[PDB]
From a paper:
Aminoacyl-tRNA synthetases (aaRSs) are an essential enzyme family for protein translation and, in several cases, have been validated drug targets. Among the aaRSs, prolyl-tRNA synthetase (PRS) is a validated drug target in Plasmodial spp and Toxoplasma gondii (Tg). In the current study, we examined five ATP-mimetics L95, L96, L97, L35, and L36, based on the 1-(pyridin-4-yl) pyrrolidin-2-one (PPL) scaffold. We successfully co-crystallized all five compounds with TgPRS (L95, L96, L97, L35, and L36) and three with HsPRS (L95, L96, and L97), all in complex with L-pro.
The compounds are stabilized by hydrogen bonds via the O atom of the phenylacetamide group and the keto O atom of oxopyrrolidine interaction with a water molecule. The oxopyrrolidine keto O atom interacts with the OG1 of side-chain Thr592 in L95, L96, and L97. The superposition of holo-TgPRS revealed no striking steric or sidechain rotameric conformational differences among the five PPL derivatives bound structures of TgPRS complexes. The high potency of these inhibitors was evident from their nanomolar IC50 values for TgPRS, i.e., L95: 139.9 nM, L96: 79.7 nM, L97: 50 nM, L35: 9.2 nM, and the exception of L36 with IC50 of 2409 nM. However, three out of five PPL derivatives, i.e., L97, L96, and L35, were found to be selective against TgPRS as opposed to its human counterpart in vitro, with enzymatic selectivity indices of 27.9, 13.5, and 8.2, respectively. For TgPRS, we observed ΔTm (°C) values of 22, 23, 20, 26, and 14 for L95, L96, L97, L35, and L36, in the presence of L-Pro, respectively, compared to the apo-TgPRS.
Numbering used by the authors:
A (entry chain A), B (entry chain A): 333 to 409, 417 to 784, 793 to 830
The structure:
Amino acid sequence: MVTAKKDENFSEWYTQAIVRSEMIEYYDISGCYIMRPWAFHIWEKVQRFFDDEIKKMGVENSYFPMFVSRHKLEKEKPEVAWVTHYGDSPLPEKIAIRPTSETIMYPAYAKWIRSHRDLPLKLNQWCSVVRWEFKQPTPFLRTREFLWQEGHTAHATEEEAWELVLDILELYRRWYEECLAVPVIKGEKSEGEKFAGGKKTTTVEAFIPENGRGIQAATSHLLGTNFAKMFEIEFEDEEGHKRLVHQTSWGCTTRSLGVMIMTHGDDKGLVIPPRVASVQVVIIPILFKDENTGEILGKCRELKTMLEKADIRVRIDDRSNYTPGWKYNHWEVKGVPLRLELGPKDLAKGTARVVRRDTGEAYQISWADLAPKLLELMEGIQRSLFEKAKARLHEGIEKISTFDEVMPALNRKHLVLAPWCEDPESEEQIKKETQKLSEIQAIEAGAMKTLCIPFDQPPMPEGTKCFYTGKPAKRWTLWGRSY
Amino acid sequence: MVTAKKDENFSEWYTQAIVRSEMIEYYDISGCYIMRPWAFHIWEKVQRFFDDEIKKMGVENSYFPMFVSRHKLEKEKPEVAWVTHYGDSPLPEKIAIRPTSETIMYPAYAKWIRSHRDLPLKLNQWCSVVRWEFKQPTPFLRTREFLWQEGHTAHATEEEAWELVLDILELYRRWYEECLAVPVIKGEKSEGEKFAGGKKTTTVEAFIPENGRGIQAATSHLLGTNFAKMFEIEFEDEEGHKRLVHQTSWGCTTRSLGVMIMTHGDDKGLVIPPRVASVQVVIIPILFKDENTGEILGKCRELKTMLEKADIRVRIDDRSNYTPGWKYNHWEVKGVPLRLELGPKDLAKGTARVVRRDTGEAYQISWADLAPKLLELMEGIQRSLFEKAKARLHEGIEKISTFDEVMPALNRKHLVLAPWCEDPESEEQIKKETQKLSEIQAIEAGAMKTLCIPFDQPPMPEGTKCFYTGKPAKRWTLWGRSY
Ligand SMILES: COc1cncc(-c2cc(F)cc(CNC(=O)c3cc(N4CC[C@@](C#N)(C5CC5)C4=O)cc(C)n3)c2)c1
Ligand SMILES: COc1cncc(-c2cc(F)cc(CNC(=O)c3cc(N4CC[C@@](C#N)(C5CC5)C4=O)cc(C)n3)c2)c1
Ligand code: PRO
Ligand code: PRO
């Protein structure tokens, strides 16, 4: 049983939820966590979805090395792990473990791209990267090693690369919202937050109500020609002139599982959206000692067969050594969206009892309706999870016009949406001031930064001033405390 | 065009074949190679096959960390890469990159397994490992980083673990023989060659005729209780007694692509078995300037649609800036098994010309027969590739009775099958003597080791003596030079 309450000790609740459901295991190297099959299966599902979608765009998978030479990493010139010795033997030149693969892939890119006919070049890989920070890790959300995909494309024109950046960002919206039922906000990162060496960084941002923090959910960068200049990636037009390619890179990580967990979980533990649950329906037979158990289990198997014909993912928990009470809790903690109960009374009526994980609502369903009804219930659970989260997201954002409204909204664990002049020095000043005010507050018991400049801009009245400098406002920006 | 001949400069031929077909790219860190999509797709295919098959056995995927602490690696107590510094900051205790994950996973195993009801525990992961040897690498076959899967299971009894070892070894036979059309020999490794700390190691072995070398294709270990003792992995029976679990581990790598390449390739370059080719049929339209090109390309698209309805994997190379001659060679080098040619004369006859990659045989096929006929041709190419390789394998093995027959058979680039007493010291002596004889031979221009003790044992006459000690022979053993 999960016992910490999500709304009272959030970090303990999260730890319990992911450990008791068998999603993660601890490890003797700090900041690394084991992903057990119950979490792993969800990764496999979103991985298959995203793979299928990028294949339709002509992206192909590949595999580049996990090591990068010191001097190719220096061509770009920090949380980088260095390998220095093969066993006992010191290396002649230390090599780093990839934190990202731009400097690993792009010398190959330069070799492969010769003519405009070679473009676009579109590659992805699934692997893990390492970012070795000493700060406190958080399972899924901030870990020293994490699984991701990174996609890396090259085009003849800037407009083609930017269209691809936005197509991918839309795939990331679908990954969170369609697969994980997590609402996200599209937008552009500020100049100070954008990717090192990139031209423009787009993001989808999510929000964790319980601690008021925004979290970057996925990212899609217009690199433009910046890395092409660095690595001499050029193509020939049909007339023979050499031109720089225009590039994109984009990535999504197992952080997405963390965000799903926190968005949908409740005081009983995990709640997994039907579209990614590896077990959508757990069938629990009632097994009175004074019953035809063989008949009950037989009907369970028949119902499994029937539901699987509709591509529903079913498990029968027929263990006689645990009570139905124990099983209910066990599969609740694990987040299975639908529980189906079959005992002698149901068998005699030709119905089953079905309980949905998100609300506890129970239904009596005849066996003949079971597949279409469960399909409909699963789509309804998925939509409900998403819409309720969308409502919490919207309740979480305060639209302000002056800096004096910031700290009251932060103290409500809200994000703010404010008219901003987009001066980078002002973002630095806002970070430092809000951090100071937070510290001063904590003495009586930090920083607010930009999360993104949303694509969907509310109306900007003609003379509106930046909320912090009083200069002309340029656009609405979303700010908050952040991961 | 590939220009080195497979039968004359084998290593140059292999390099050309994998580079010119765009399968691999070089990298500035020795012993690591980039896998471009043309090779990567074949990995994805065999990966899907093996995943599907182990899932039916109840194995589930997971992901364990890439790092292992010095002292958990010492619990077992060398080609191990050590991480010592996060950027500038020296680590308090150096950590190694995984060469294999037994010591990473098995402390978790010990924590998770409490009762016999917890068994069997069956996990797999797909990742890369590093084995940092200074010797000369070979793309796919011996690399410093390589992709694999490793599966790790734990059972209540030794017989259950051994049945699983053999079930997996059969999956590896299917991986090579059914998917890659590469014949392999099942058997048990000798005491000196078996896995460190394991009880018994089984293998499937392949043979490379052009250099006479056996190569271990995949491996499936009975660990028995050895690692359970090391890591305290114990379970409780129903009466409450604690017993050691019995374990297996097993792995397969991208070496398998290397073996496929070398087995089927010819002087024109790659030949890819239809069951794993990412392009099974390349459609090449003839594009005379004085023709209805639109009609020709339209019919190409229709034929693609029709073939894809039969799950055939099709690409249309409709580029006008290359000749059909150039395209024929380009897709030959890449190993596409079937080429389909459509020009105005074919269109007028309602037929297509189809050329198979392995023999060059051409066929005229009416459009109505095209899907069933190509399906049949692809199964015939797959079978032919396999049977011819099976014949080369069989021609490659000499059955001997005395040590004086070894060097003549090695000089024929053959393996030998000999009655052996299985004394480990004799294997060491045979390695050293055959290496010396080889050196002495090379002066006028090394080692033979056991490859496996085959499951399929030829008849052993009642008084047959070991071929090297003259002691009683125990079993037939397969020996050869080796990777
Ligand atoms: C208060 O204490 C902290 C403050 N700041 C950092 C940490 C921290 C602690 C650690 F122990 C280890 C690390 C290193 N891992 C990461 O930084 C990281 C980044 C991301 N990112 C970055 C943005 C991105 C998106 N979208 C990009 C696509 C990639 C995405 O997913 C995802 C994950 C799982 N890990 C950070 C702790
Ligand atoms: C004459 O020069 C040499 C002599 N001896 C070694 C090398 C060499 C050169 C290097 F630069 C790097 C390395 C390290 N990589 C590997 O040892 C290795 C082993 C395997 N293995 C081992 C057995 C196995 C099977 N079945 C097990 C499942 C795993 C399987 O696939 C596969 C691959 C791709 N790499 C070795 C060079
Ligand atoms: O790390 C990043 O943000 C980009 C996207 C994945 C590859 N590099
Ligand atoms: O390296 C080996 O041979 C075994 C099988 C994969 C995991 N460890």
